[PDB]
Design a protein around this ligand. Structure first.
Ligand SMILES: CCCCCCCCCCCCCCCCCC(=O)OC[C@H](COP(=O)(O)OCCN)OC(=O)CCCCCCCCCCCCCCCCC
Ligand SMILES: CCCCCCCCCCCCCCCCCC(=O)OC[C@H](COP(=O)(O)OCCN)OC(=O)CCCCCCCCCCCCCCCCC
Ligand SMILES: CCCCCCCCCCCCCCCCCC(=O)OC[C@H](COP(=O)(O)OCCN)OC(=O)CCCCCCCCCCCCCCCCC
Ligand SMILES: CCCCCCCCCCCCCCCCCC(=O)OC[C@H](COP(=O)(O)OCCN)OC(=O)CCCCCCCCCCCCCCCCC
Ligand SMILES: CCCCCCCCCCCCCCCCCC(=O)OC[C@H](COP(=O)(O)OCCN)OC(=O)CCCCCCCCCCCCCCCCC
Ligand SMILES: CCCCCCCCCCCCCCCCCC(=O)OC[C@H](COP(=O)(O)OCCN)OC(=O)CCCCCCCCCCCCCCCCC
Ligand SMILES: CCCCCCCCCCCCCCCCCC(=O)OC[C@H](COP(=O)(O)OCCN)OC(=O)CCCCCCCCCCCCCCCCC
Ligand SMILES: CC(C)CCC[C@@H](C)[C@H]1CC[C@H]2[C@@H]3CC=C4C[C@@H](OC(=O)CCC(=O)O)CC[C@]4(C)[C@H]3CC[C@]12C
Ligand SMILES: CC(C)CCC[C@@H](C)[C@H]1CC[C@H]2[C@@H]3CC=C4C[C@@H](OC(=O)CCC(=O)O)CC[C@]4(C)[C@H]3CC[C@]12C
Ligand SMILES: *[C@@H]1O[C@H](CO)[C@@H](O)[C@H](O)[C@H]1NC(C)=O
Ligand SMILES: *[C@@H]1O[C@H](CO)[C@@H](O)[C@H](O)[C@H]1NC(C)=O
Ligand SMILES: *[C@@H]1O[C@H](CO)[C@@H](O)[C@H](O)[C@H]1NC(C)=O
Ligand SMILES: *[C@@H]1O[C@H](CO)[C@@H](O)[C@H](O)[C@H]1NC(C)=O
Ligand SMILES: *[C@@H]1O[C@H](CO)[C@@H](O)[C@H](O)[C@H]1NC(C)=O
Ligand SMILES: [Ca+2]
Ligand SMILES: [Ca+2]
Length: 967
């Protein structure tokens, strides 16, 4: 019936409210009358569904089966694992709503097309999963340990190793003597009496891993947690810094390789496979409305009374300048004819609100009336609005997914965590925020370590399944939108070898250079020579030829010439020279002009940029509106005072009595200039949570922040992320859519793969025997394949039969070789896994497609490297003297990431590019004339790195996409 449809959707949605209120802390029932009422509600719903199923047992087939399955579980449940099962109850609804029968059907129909991509992932997880366990097995456990003969006195109460101030986040991991770790022993700080830190010489294994028990490399189970965290690019750096302490500094290659293979090449390959499968008077008012809005953006905490008053007066004059047009438009036009054109209705509503807090805030709707004068924006907005219908279903589908997972997360770890941590799963409202948080991947791993250490280490499957299937229904969204769009002489070379030699001097520069040594003397008179050569080169092109690229080349030579004529005048200022040095780091840009392949790509990006250029203005407009709106809400609010106590304190007048310092948060909403930076850490999606917390804690202009003072401010930040993400998605879509217009042997190998995963840390003697004994078997069978007779297989066996020989020689043959030679050889048995590459015909076809499009990518890749060269060089100049001793604490920069070289400033620029804690880096370049420069350097780098990385993905998409079309 049409009315049989609503009896079901009444009791399915009645079910959710009985799941919505869980109150997990209050376990074992009988808490209140309401709890009993909720229990009573359950019986009615369960009784009704069984009866409904029976009516249908009197009479989508797949969907019908699912309803029966949930019902059977419910009956069994009535007869704590069973209790969590209830959550599935909400899934009955997918069949009920038609708009979801279809979407889900498509989702479920795409999985057999991701057969190949999934297969590729296993190779990546397995290959890097074993190389981790071969190398860093139980390496993380070690700590400085006493020399174990002498026991310290009872009175001192020291632990027995070196504990840091926070042993859960940053333990002190010493490096074994047989290894070369960065953090060697005896580097421990003097104790704050006798200093016991001077007696921590021995370094040996300890019971606990670095983050709770979670970050660890001593099973194949615990390696795949850490590989999954590197691939999701969240907190990946923390892992690499522990490896570099325990086992050398050359371990960075493993991580970089993992990231440009697992994290970029593979995660953005299941976007490619999933989408290739489908295939005069009015001109005066425009000046008036702009200067009204710009009149709003001049707030700024602590403005003088002469300015607040002027602004108030200004508002009054403007209102009459809009009212008397309304009066004019109500007299030169008729009253009925005024209403009919629909923008004239809206422009009169703003007048009535103006004449008559919320009203004060509302003034920001006055920019809206400007779209009556822009034809292009008017057309653009409608197109954007058209996509909402397609988007609404997925969002509706997404809501069910968050609800289910926020309900499930209450059952597993509801009241286990930690006062409790802010990201906790108890109260529902803070469970849906935590599940929305993991879907933006921002500190999803800080919740993992509370999750794994509270229930069990098998609780990573809750977070693997929330991140995977949350990101799988978000890749579909891009594709669904995307599909709809588809249905509507030698001179150049010779001078190039002078620039690449020019780069080496730029790279060489660092602040720790003596003014009189030979590194200094070489850099001064290589400046003279290069400038002269370039200067000579410039005339040749102008006495012969008598253009955009040339001016850039021309400007650079002039700047260099000017630099010498202030460097000569050094005796006779400093400020001009500093500006020149930064400008002098733009020398690398010359390379683009010389290379034709590279040159075309740079021009091409600009042309590609134009179609979505218009949308950017709309996106830009939103930042200003939320920038002004944001400023009004928290002008004096982000003043948090730091001390050791931070209790019994409410005011600046109280926090000065105890002598605690007052800290204005680095990211605050004081000006429109600061609010526009703090809305870039929100938009970036990194560190948005840590901004959001003090936006919820914000109380008053001179007050101390109260935790969770106003949880209604979640609407200011969560709603901002869902329209930044929406706008960014549209821009990506716009750019793409305009371009268009045996069987024994394999089994034997499989058996071998399982055996290599058997190894762990402190495996017993017999499994060390059996594993070794087993190897002697698989060595024989692969020779028996080369008897029975591809080039790689011959090479593969050679490594094997070589390995058995080396290991054996050491025990009873002769003097051993160095252990390092043996260890490398053991790893090289992983090459046997590559042979099953041949069996997978499908993976190779999918894989080659990337190669065909590789040449376009190569130019982009070259461009990406050039951009790190300019920024890295630039970075060293600005941030050379930042340091991190005990007197200067630093948040993002540290021992492993500094800007004091060109090498260390090249690794530091890589984790800004992946997006891991770059706001902690920008937070402490500010901590010491740097307030304007430092946000320009970190905002313009991120928007130009991510924009090159987008143009790679859409270039791999196009070549791959074209294959499907020919058929
Ligand atoms: C794709 C499927 C691949 C399946 C591979 C299965 C390999 C199993 C290896 C194994 O059995 O590991 C034994 C190890 C023992 O650990 P434990 O008992 O703590 O140590 C005793 C001595 N200290 O304990 C472990 O290593 C457990 C590893 C579990 C990995 C499960 C992964 C499931 C998929 C996610
Ligand atoms: C497509 C189909 C989609 C179906 C979705 C179905 C959703 C049903 C949700 C029902 C929620 C009932 C919640 C009843 C309740 O008492 O929960 C309290 C919770 C928090 O409210 P509050 O009083 O502010 O408590 C603060 C401390 N937790 O209340 C809340 O704040 C919950 C807010 C939920 C907002 C969801 C996003 C909009
Ligand atoms: C209006 C709602 C529009 C939702 C659009 C979602 C979207 O297109 O995705 C953008 C963004 C991508 O996030 P993700 O791929 O997980 O990577 C995060 C890296 N920090 O995804 C997000 O920002 C999270 C979106 C979650 C949406 C939940 C449903 C809200 C209704
Ligand atoms: C659009 C979404 C609108 C959601 C509306 C939820 C309304 C919840 C509600 O009515 O709560 C009332 C409650 C009253 O508070 P009060 O009278 O002071 O009592 C305090 C002691 N309980 O209010 C409170 O005490 C605090 C209520 C906070 C509700 C904030 C909701 C934010 C939703 C963010 C969703 C994030 C994305 C999810 C996907
Ligand atoms: C939609 C439903 C919105 C319902 C909002 C209800 C807000 C409310 O109940 O009033 C209090 C709240 C906080 O005001 P305040 O008094 O400054 O806070 C405590 C100071 N001791 O009043 C507020 O000022 C909080 C306003 C929160 C909403 C932010 C706007 C989001 C805009 C999204 C656009 C898309
Ligand atoms: C697939 C087959 C890949 C085969 C890779 C073989 C690597 C063998 C490494 C053994 C290292 C053993 C060791 O104890 O390392 C110590 C070493 C000390 O530093 P060292 O450079 O020797 O300093 C000079 C001292 N006189 O410190 C080091 O140098 C450590 C170097 C680690 C390098 C790791 C490279 C990993 C590459 C994995 C590629 C996977 C590709 C997957 C594609 C899909
Ligand atoms: C693939 C193979 C890659 C091999 C790269 C070898 C780089 C060797 C760097 C080095 O030896 O150290 C100097 C410098 C910083 O090293 P530092 O931390 O000062 O010293 C630690 C050990 N004494 O080295 C560093 O800055 C570390 C990273 C340097 C990366 C330079 C990359 C230049 C362009 C790369 C294009 C690709
Ligand atoms: C995003 C682009 C397209 C436009 C960016 C415009 C901003 C750079 C403008 C808008 C109004 C300006 C602000 C107007 C009021 C002042 C208060 C002023 O207060 C003080 O610091 C006084 C003491 C001192 O300056 O030393 C600081 C600069 C500031 C925030 C200005 C900073 C630059 C602002 C934010
Ligand atoms: C709209 C697109 C480009 C997304 C990114 C926009 C912003 C992230 C960009 C646009 C121009 C940038 C701003 C250019 C001028 C400066 C002024 C500067 O103002 C001050 O710090 C004055 C000192 C004080 O306020 O105390 C703060 C950074 C800021 C706002 C920059 C912050 C980052 C901005 C806002
Ligand atoms: C071991 O103990 C002896 C005394 O039995 C002591 O002389 C020696 O210093 C100790 N060694 C270490 C490394 O602590
Ligand atoms: C260091 O401590 C470990 C564990 O207590 C022990 O095995 C080792 O022999 C100690 N080394 C020295 C030199 O005492
Ligand atoms: C804070 O005040 C409470 C009473 O309001 C008191 O019990 C507590 O000792 C105070 N805390 C400190 C740091 O003294
Ligand atoms: C802050 O000072 C104390 C805080 O304990 C209190 O008297 C008052 O509420 C606040 N304002 C003052 C006193 O200036
Ligand atoms: C290796 O040889 C030595 C002497 O040649 C002998 O003592 C030892 O037992 C041999 N190893 C094994 C495992 O038999
Ligand atoms: Ca991230
Ligand atoms: Ca992060």
């Amino acid at each position: 019936n049409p009315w049989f449809e609503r009896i079901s959707m009444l009791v399915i949605l009645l079910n959710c409210v009985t799941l919505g209120m869980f109150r997990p802390c209050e376990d074992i029932a009988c808490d209140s009358q309401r709890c009993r009422i909720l229990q009573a509600f359950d019986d009615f719903i369960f009784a009704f569904f069984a009866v409904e199923m029976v009516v249908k047992m009197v009479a989508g087939d797949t969907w019908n089966r699912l309803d029966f399955f949930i019902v059977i579980a419910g009956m069994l449940e009535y007869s704590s694992a069973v209790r969590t099962v209830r959550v599935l109850r909400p899934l009955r609804a997918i069949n009920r709503v038609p708009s979801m029968r279809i979407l889900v059907t498509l989702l479920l129909d795409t999985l057999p097309m991701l057969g190949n991509v999934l297969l590729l992932c296993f190779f990546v997880f397995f290959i890097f999963g074993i190389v981790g366990v071969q190398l860093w097995a139980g390496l993380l456990r070690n700590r400085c340990f006493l020399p174990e003969n002498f026991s310290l006195p009872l009175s001192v109460d020291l632990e027995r190793y070196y504990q840091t101030e926070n042993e859960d986040e940053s333990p002190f991991i010493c490096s074994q003597p047989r290894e070369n770790g960065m953090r060697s022993c005896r580097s421990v700080p003097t104790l704050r009496c006798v200093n016991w830190n001077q007696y921590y010489t021995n370094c040996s294994a300890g019971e606990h891993n670095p983050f709770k028990g979670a970050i660890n490399f001593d099973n194949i189970g615990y390696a795949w947690i850490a590989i999954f965290q590197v691939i999701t690019l969240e907190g990946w750096v923390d892992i690499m810094y522990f490896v570099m302490d325990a086992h050398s500094f050359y371990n960075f290659i493993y991580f970089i390789l993992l990231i440009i293979v697992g994290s970029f090449f593979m995660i953005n390959l299941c976007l490619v496979v999933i989408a290739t499968q489908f295939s005069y008077f009015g001109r005066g008012i425009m000046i008036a409305i702009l200067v009204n809005t710009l009149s709003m953006g001049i707030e700024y905490h602590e403005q003088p009374e002469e300015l607040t008053n002027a602004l108030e007066i200004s508002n009054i004059v403007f209102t009459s300048l809009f009212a008397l047009e309304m009066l004019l438009k109500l007299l030169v036009y008729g009253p009925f004819g005024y209403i009919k054109n629909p923008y004239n209705i809206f422009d009169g509503v703003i007048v009535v609100i103006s004449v008559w807090s919320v009203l004060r805030t509302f003034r920001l709707m006055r920019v809206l009336k400007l779209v009556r004068f822009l034809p292009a924006l008017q057309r653009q907005l409608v197109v954007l609005m058209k996509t909402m219908d397609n988007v609404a279903t997925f969002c509706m589908l997404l809501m069910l997914f968050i609800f289910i997972f926020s309900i499930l997360g209450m059952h597993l770890f509801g009241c286990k965590f930690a006062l409790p941590d802010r990201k906790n799963f108890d109260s529902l409202l803070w469970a849906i925020v935590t599940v929305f948080q993991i879907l933006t991947q921002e500190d999803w791993n800080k919740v993992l370590y509370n999750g794994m250490a509270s229930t069990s280490s098998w609780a990573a499957l809750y977070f693997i399944a929330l991140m995977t299937f949350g990101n799988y229904v978000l890749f579909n969204l891009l594709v669904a939108i995307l599909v709809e769009g588809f249905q509507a002489k030698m001179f150049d070379h010779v001078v190039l070898v002078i620039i690449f030699l020019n780069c080496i001097t730029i790279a060489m520069e660092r602040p720790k250079i003596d003014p009189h040594s030979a590194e200094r003397i070489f850099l001064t008179l290589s400046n003279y020579i290069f400038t002269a050569v370039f200067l000579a080169e410039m005339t040749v092109k102008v006495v012969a030829l008598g253009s955009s690229w040339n001016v850039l080349d021309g400007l650079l030579v002039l700047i260099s010439v000017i630099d010498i004529l202030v460097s000569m005048v050094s005796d006779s200022i400093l400020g001009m020279l500093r500006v020149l040095r930064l400008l002098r780091t733009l020398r690398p840009l010359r390379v683009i002009s010389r290379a034709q392949g590279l040159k075309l790509v740079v021009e091409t990006l600009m042309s590609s940029l134009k179609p979505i250029g218009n949308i950017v203005v709309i996106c830009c407009a939103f930042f200003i509106i939320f920038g002004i709106l944001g400023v009004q809400l928290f002008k004096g609010k982000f003043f948090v005072c730091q001390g050791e106590d931070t209790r019994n304190i409410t005011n600046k007048s109280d926090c000065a009595e105890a002598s605690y310092r007052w800290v204005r948060h680095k990211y605050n909403f004081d000006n429109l200039g600061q609010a526009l930076m703090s809305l870039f850490v929100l938009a970036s999606k990194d560190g948005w949570v840590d901004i959001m917390y003090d936006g919820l804690d914000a109380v008053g202009v001179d007050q101390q922040p109260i935790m969770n003072h106003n949880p209604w401010m979640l609407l200011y930040f969560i709603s901002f992320l869902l329209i930044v993400a929406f706008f960014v998605l549209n821009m990506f879509v716009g750019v793409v859519v305009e371009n268009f217009h045996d069987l024994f042997i394999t089994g034997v190998i499989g058996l071998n793969v399982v055996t290599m995963a058997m190894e762990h840390y402190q495996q017993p003697q017999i499994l060390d025997e059996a594993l070794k004994i087993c190897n002697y078997i698989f060595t024989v069978i692969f020779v028996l394949e080369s008897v029975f007779k591809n080039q790689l297989d011959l090479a593969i066996v050679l490594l094997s039969i070589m390995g058995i020989t080396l290991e054996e020689i050491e025990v009873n043959a002769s003097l051993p070789i160095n252990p390092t030679i043996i260890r490398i050889m053991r790893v090289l048995r992983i090459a046997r896994v590559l042979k099953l590459l041949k069996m997978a015909v499908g993976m190779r076809a999918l894989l080659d497609t990337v190669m065909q499009a590789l040449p376009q990518v190569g130019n982009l890749g070259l461009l990406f490297m050039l951009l790190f060269f300019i920024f890295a060089a630039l970075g060293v100049e600005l941030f050379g003297d930042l340091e991190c001793d005990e007197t200067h604490p630093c948040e993002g920069l540290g021992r492993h990431a500094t800007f004091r070289n060109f090498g260390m400033a090249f690794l530091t620029l890589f984790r800004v590019s992946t997006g891991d804690n770059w706001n902690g880096i920008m937070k402490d370049t500010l901590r010491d004339y740097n307030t304007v420069i430092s946000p320009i350097y970190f905002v313009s780098f991120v928007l130009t790195a991510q924009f090159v990385l987008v143009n790679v993905v859409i270039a791999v998409l196009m070549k791959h996409l074209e294959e499907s079309n020919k058929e």
